Design a binder for this molecule. Structure first.
Ligand SMILES: COc1ccc2c(O[C@@H]3C[C@H]4C(=O)N[C@]5(C(=O)NS(=O)(=O)C6CC6)C[C@H]5/C=C\CCCCN(C)C(=O)[C@@H]4C3)cc(-c3nc(C(C)C)cs3)nc2c1C
Ligand SMILES: *[C@@H]1O[C@H](CO)[C@@H](O[C@@H]2O[C@H](CO)[C@@H](O)[C@H](O)[C@H]2NC(C)=O)[C@H](O)[C@H]1NC(C)=O
Ligand SMILES: *[C@@H]1O[C@H](CO)[C@@H](O)[C@H](O)[C@H]1NC(C)=O
Length: 563
């Protein structure tokens, strides 16, 4: 079978590598409640995976190429697997877990601090998590380099497309098992599950991070086994690392992809938030289904992109042109989102006054209306109640409603002072709990967003394999492994970490309501002005793509001249 055998082992690693990445996020919430660790330190534990990966990825790629490549992938995979077991050890070494809107009137940090003194189990998760990052280093730079050197004729692109196609399954298997395990209690098998009172919907409930990280670890350990058997074939660092740079086509190409990948990565991280705020439509009904139909199409694009490159005879200049064509199409489709925007959310007490007689320019220092003034209720509390009129209110207490139907279900307030607007005395002022449902005309618009979103992703998916394929050709044959590593480090150090963080900083200015944390001045933002959020999130995302497209035109001219 020649190089085909190697592909099978590599594809298995790709499923394992992606599985490790998704699992940490799918269980991160459970870990915090279980270890009685401070919220601040939590980001740090999540960060542990990234630092391990970034620190060793550039060094290993250059050094790794000289050494045999099949085995190395194996050592790293194997290390990853040990980390997975290492990450979940605490559960086996810790005792049994211990549990411990309104009508108008008319300590966690301390626990962590105690734990911090001397030695605590939170260090174990961090250590183990870092091991996964170290283990990841030789899966893409060393592995991808091997396929290119020994591929026959122009077949390398097609093989890469297949691996990505297989790689997409990783998250799929990971959400099934990941969520399924969450339904299982953390000490399953140890404690009699008939006495545990907390429920999977309960805040207290702690998920099985130990089985969540055990399956990934076991999967990674088993995945390594084929590699060891495989045959080898079917001042040095500083000098070489410099040569990767001062290579006009290559240097701008890495900056070019940092900007484009950041836009895509940034968009993916906040798309659910954007969809929820702009169209009211929740991800609860969206992500649950749209997140599915999407996987095969995204996977289909990756394979098709690889196939298109393989079938046609494409040179290095040709590949770039094809990559640019996807980018032009992606941006044009991306630019279409601005046209399809619903009207701004109307909330009493923020965009407009509680009475609703006239709008207020600034949400801050909003003077309470007469209906609002009669009831003395806290401004900070948030409880979106939808009135008969259709105007959202900050809280039922703020609305002036003093009656409830019982605790059985959202109690349509018997009367609401603000809701019963002048001219409709007969009409009821009762309100229903939950964010006001968006108007029927707007819902139709939503679908337009989702249809283009799937379509845009597919076009992005078509060119997704191109970035990796293009990079190998421009750089000299000797440094292929290193070039990918430097590019991989740059994409996952800035695109991976900086993009969401600066997006959040930029996005927050638009936000109009701040939830009050016990310690933090601002913990979460309840609602964002829709036009401001749309203009800023899409605009920043689009601006990056426009810059990305501009680089391609400059690059194409440069590439054509050299070749
Ligand atoms: C790490 O976690 C992520 C990261 C990014 C994701 C992403 O954004 C895009 C997919 C992602 C990617 O190709 N992922 C994989 C891969 O193979 N990268 S690669 O570099 O190997 C490839 C050869 C070029 C499997 C990950 C391996 C390494 C990531 C490399 C980081 C830089 N990079 C190229 C990206 O982030 C890209 C951008 C999209 C998605 C999607 N999720 C859905 C579902 C769940 C609703 C639809 S699309 N998941 C992602 C996950 C989970
Ligand atoms: C709104 O509140 C009023 C007062 O509690 C409700 O009931 C009556 O008020 C009128 C005028 O005083 C009279 O019919 C009686 O004094 C009250 N008893 C009833 C129930 O008739 C009114 O029904 C409420 N409207 C709602 C629930 O939308
Ligand atoms: C609203 O109140 C009116 C009486 O004013 C009553 O006839 C009607 O059935 C009520 N409808 C709802 C939605 O409770």
């Amino acid at each position: 079978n020649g190089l085909k055998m190697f592909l099978a082992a590599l594809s298995l690693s790709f499923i394992a590598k992606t599985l490790g990445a998704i699992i940490m996020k799918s269980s991160i919430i459970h870990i915090e409640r279980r270890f009685e660790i401070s919220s601040s330190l939590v980001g740090f534990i999540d960060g542990s995976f990234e630092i391990g990966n970034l620190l060793v990825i550039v060094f290993v790629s250059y050094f790794g190429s000289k050494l045999h490549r099949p085995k190395l992938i194996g050592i790293g995979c194997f290390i990853m697997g040990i980390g997975g077991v290492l990450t979940a050890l605490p559960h086996f070494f810790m005792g049994y877990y211990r549990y411990s809107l309104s009508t108008c009137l008319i300590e966690i940090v301390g626990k962590g601090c105690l734990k911090e003194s001397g030695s605590y189990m939170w260090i174990y998760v961090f250590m183990g998590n870092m091991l996964r990052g170290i283990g990841e280093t030789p899966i893409v730079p060393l592995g991808l380099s091997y396929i290119d050197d020994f591929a026959k004729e122009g077949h390398s692109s097609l093989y890469l497309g297949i691996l990505n196609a297989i790689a997409m399954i990783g998250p799929i298997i990971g959400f099934t098992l990941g969520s399924l395990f969450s339904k299982m209690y953390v000490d399953i098998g140890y404690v009699d599950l008939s006495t545990i009172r907390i429920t999977p919907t309960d805040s207290r409930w702690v998920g099985a991070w130990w089985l969540n990280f055990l399956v990934s670890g076991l999967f990674s350990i088993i995945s390594s086994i084929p590699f060891f058997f495989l045959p080898q074939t079917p001042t040095g660092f500083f000098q070489s690392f410099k040569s990767i740079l001062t290579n006009p086509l290559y240097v701008m190409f890495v900056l070019l992809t940092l900007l484009q990948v950041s836009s895509y990565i940034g968009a993916f991280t906040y798309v659910f938030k954007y969809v929820e705020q702009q169209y009211g439509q929740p991800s609860s009904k969206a992500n649950i289904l749209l997140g599915v139909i999407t996987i095969p199409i995204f996977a289909s694009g990756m394979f098709l992109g690889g196939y298109i490159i393989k079938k046609f005879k494409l040179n290095t200049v040709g590949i770039a042109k094809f990559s640019c064509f996807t980018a032009v199409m992606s941006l044009s489709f991306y630019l279409l989102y601005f046209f399809i925007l619903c009207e701004n959310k109307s909330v009493a007490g923020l965009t407009m006054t509680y009475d609703g007689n006239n709008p207020v320019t600034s949400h801050r220092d909003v003077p309470l209306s007469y209906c609002n003034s009669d009831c003395n209720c806290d401004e900070s509390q948030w409880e979106p109640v939808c009135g008969n009129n259709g105007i959202t209110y900050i809280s039922p207490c703020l609305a002036g409603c003093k009656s409830s139907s019982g605790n059985k279900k959202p109690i349509v307030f018997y009367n609401c002072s603000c809701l019963e607007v002048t001219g409709l005395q007969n009409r009821n002022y009762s309100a229903h709990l939950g964010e006001c449902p968006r108007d029927d005309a707007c819902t139709r618009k939503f679908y337009f967003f989702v249809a283009i979103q799937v379509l845009n992703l597919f076009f992005s998916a078509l060119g997704g394999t191109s970035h990796v394929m293009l990079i190998v050709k421009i750089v000299q044959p000797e440094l292929k492994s290193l070039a990918l590593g430097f590019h991989s480090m740059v994409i996952r150090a800035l695109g991976g970490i900086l993009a969401p963080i600066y997006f959040g900083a930029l996005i927050d200015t638009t936000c109009i309501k701040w939830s009050t944390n016990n310690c933090g001045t601002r913990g979460s933002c309840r609602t964002y002005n829709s036009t401001s959020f749309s203009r800023v999130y899409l605009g920043l995302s689009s601006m990056l793509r426009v810059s990305s497209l501009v680089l391609y035109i400059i690059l194409i001219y440069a590439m054509k001249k050299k070749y």
